[PDB]
Amino acid sequence: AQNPNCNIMIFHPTKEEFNDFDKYIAYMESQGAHRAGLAKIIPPKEWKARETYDNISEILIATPLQQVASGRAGVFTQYHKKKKAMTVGEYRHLANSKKYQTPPHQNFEDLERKYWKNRIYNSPIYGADISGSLFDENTKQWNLGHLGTIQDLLEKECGVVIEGVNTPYLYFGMWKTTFAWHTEDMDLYSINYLHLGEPKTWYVVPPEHGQRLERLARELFPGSSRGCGAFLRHKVALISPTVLKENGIPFNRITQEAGEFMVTFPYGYHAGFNHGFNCAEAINFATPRWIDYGKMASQCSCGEARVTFSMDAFVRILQPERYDLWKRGQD
Numbered sequence: 001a002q003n004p005n006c007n008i009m010i011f012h013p014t015k016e017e018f019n020d021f022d023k024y025i026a027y028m029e030s031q032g033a034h035r036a037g038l039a040k041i042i043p044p045k046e047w048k049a050r051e052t053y054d055n056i057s058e059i060l061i062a063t064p065l066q067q068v069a070s071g072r073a074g075v076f077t078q079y080h081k082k083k084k085a086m087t088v089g090e091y092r093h094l095a096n097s098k099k100y101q102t103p104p105h106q107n108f109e110d111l112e113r114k115y116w117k118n119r120i121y122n123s124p125i126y127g128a129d130i131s132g133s134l135f136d137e138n139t140k141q142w143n144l145g146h147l148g149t150i151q152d153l154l155e156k157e158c159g160v161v162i163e164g165v166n167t168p169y170l171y172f173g174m175w176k177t178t179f180a181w182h183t184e185d186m187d188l189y190s191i192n193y194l195h196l197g198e199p200k201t202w203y204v205v206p207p208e209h210g211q212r213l214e215r216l217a218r219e220l221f222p223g224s225s226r227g228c229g230a231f232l233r234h235k236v237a238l239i240s241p242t243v244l245k246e247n248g249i250p251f252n253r254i255t256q257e258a259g260e261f262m263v264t265f266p267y268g269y270h271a272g273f274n275h276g277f278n279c280a281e282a283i284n285f286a287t288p289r290w291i292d293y294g295k296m297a298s299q300c301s302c303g304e305a306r307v308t309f310s311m312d313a314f315v316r317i318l319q320p321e322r323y324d325l326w327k328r329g330q331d
């Protein structure tokens, strides 16, 4: 069995290997990459996403979200308070302000220490989940707006044509902006390209051990767990690496820098934080190997998770027994 310790693998595809996206995902899996839940892909030196980032300031962040924490430093939830619209230029200035800017630090490990010590005492503002793309239309390799769609994959594998669309999303971050512990909708893959700016640190639990994280989470957030049998779908709970280690939860960590891709694999729980002002693009995707995970994915039906239009067909076709309850949670 390849990668039996479930380490995060880093790949350096050549320009030739960068042509065929599906083929390379399958290659990474042949080497055991998916066992970690997360892989990093460093693009060949010949590749670029676009020519420059000099002209992005006028993008609108219609609903910036202030991420307010509750709990203790290593075990907390966050809620998202909606703020007034602002441009990316305005958001960048805010991120760089004394109130929000990254503190002085020695290295990534020092900044990680500072994150986990102090995150809860601040409320950073995240420009998350903005439909759009920063890839140039002429970028033919690993262009996240040009991937094969999940509806087409489902139709190819299973024969059923379904409604729905699959487009990318932009994320504008600042110091301490946080992504809570989650797997993707329907336990899909995700891919995330860090276009510009400061790094993103990731934590990940191997898919084969995801239920260990779920059991810890139920213990640590006992009210939330009574409320919903899949409350991590709410995407609000944080647990620090120190707490995970104290509880024997297998995990790994890695820092993504600008110009690098990360892929999350089906049922790979992940969480993390941004180091300073940055912009990432991400999308969900599927492969043949996903279908079995999609059939078994948990679902939130309590009303909280509320998701895209396109998840309806995935539930309907892959989880017909669950569909009526889930759709009620949508309504």
Ligand SMILES: O=C(O)CNC(=O)C(=O)O
Pocket: 171, 178, 179, 190, 191, 192, 264, 270, 280, 282, 283
């Ligand atoms: O970058 C973020 O805030 C969160 N991203 C992801 O969870 C992802 O790409 O799957």
Ligand SMILES: [Mg+2]
Pocket: 055, 056, 057, 058, 059
């Ligand atoms: Mg612009």
Ligand code: NI
Pocket: 182, 183, 184, 190, 264, 270
């Ligand atoms: Ni994710």
Ligand SMILES: [Zn+2]
Pocket: 227, 228, 229, 230, 231, 233, 234, 300, 301, 302, 303, 304, 305
């Ligand atoms: Zn729920």
